[PDB]
From a paper:
Subsequent trials were performed with N-terminally truncated Usb1 by removing the first 58 amino acids (residues 59–275) that was designed to mimic the crystallizable S. cerevisiae and human orthologs of Usb1 (5,11,14). The structure of KmUsb1 was determined by single isomorphous replacement with anomalous scattering (SIRAS) methods and a uranyl acetate heavy atom derivative. The asymmetric unit contains three subunits, each of which is essentially identical in structure with an average alpha carbon pairwise r.m.s.d. of 0.63 Å for residues 61–275. The overall K. marxianus, S. cerevisiae and human Usb1 structures are highly homologous, although KmUsb1 more closely resembles ScUsb1 (the r.m.s.d. values are 3.1 Å for 182 aligned alpha carbon residues between KmUsb1 versus ScUsb1, and 4.1 Å for 159 aligned alpha carbon residues between KmUsb1 versus HsUsb1).
Usb1 is a member of the 2H phosphodiesterase superfamily of enzymes, which contain two vicinal active site HxS/T motifs that are essential for catalysis. We examine the structure and function of Usb1 from Kluyveromyces marxianus, which shares 25 and 19% sequence identity to the S. cerevisiae and Homo sapiens orthologs of Usb1, respectively. We find that the origin of CPDase activity is related to a loop structure that is conserved in yeast and forms a distinct penultimate (n – 1) nucleotide binding site.
Author numbering: 61 to 198, 202 to 275
The structure:
Amino acid sequence: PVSKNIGFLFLELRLDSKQQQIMDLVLKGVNAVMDTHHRNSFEPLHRGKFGAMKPLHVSLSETMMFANESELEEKMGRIRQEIRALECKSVPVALSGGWLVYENFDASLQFLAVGLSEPARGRLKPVLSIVEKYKPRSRQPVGLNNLHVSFGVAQNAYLQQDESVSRQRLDSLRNLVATEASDRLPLLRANLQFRCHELKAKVGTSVITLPL
């Protein structure tokens, strides 16, 4: 369908029981601040209905829109082969710094995130380099400067207002979570760490695994 000839690369982060409980209390605390300030709350991304588990992610490419099935296979195969040829056998994922808020492509959703640590970004640099080499030439770039894990997602209440009003409320939301909702970030950063032994790629409607 719409996803024909679309590819995207990412890391999958499955949380253990302790990490799930930490994210419950961190997000509850953030959302108490959102309530106090009459802001939209963040839906936790690590849980579904009835506490069904959902993995978290690190995006490693933009949405890659290839011109045809042949180019999809040519470029994704080269990506897979070159990632396999890397020396590394696993990459660490750990977080550094404060809350970030990233918008999706139509600004309808605002994701509460933390950036990757300097060593985590450094170990992913050779992966990003491979993606940059093979991705289609064909507006939300993924790069070393913005690698992150998103933990919650809120609706943009200002989606249909003037762009400048929506951007102002986004910047004051970013300031609000940083100034008033950051006290449990040391607990999050100490515990939300992972080691990934494979990448994933969405290709069309299928997901493939790319071993390290």
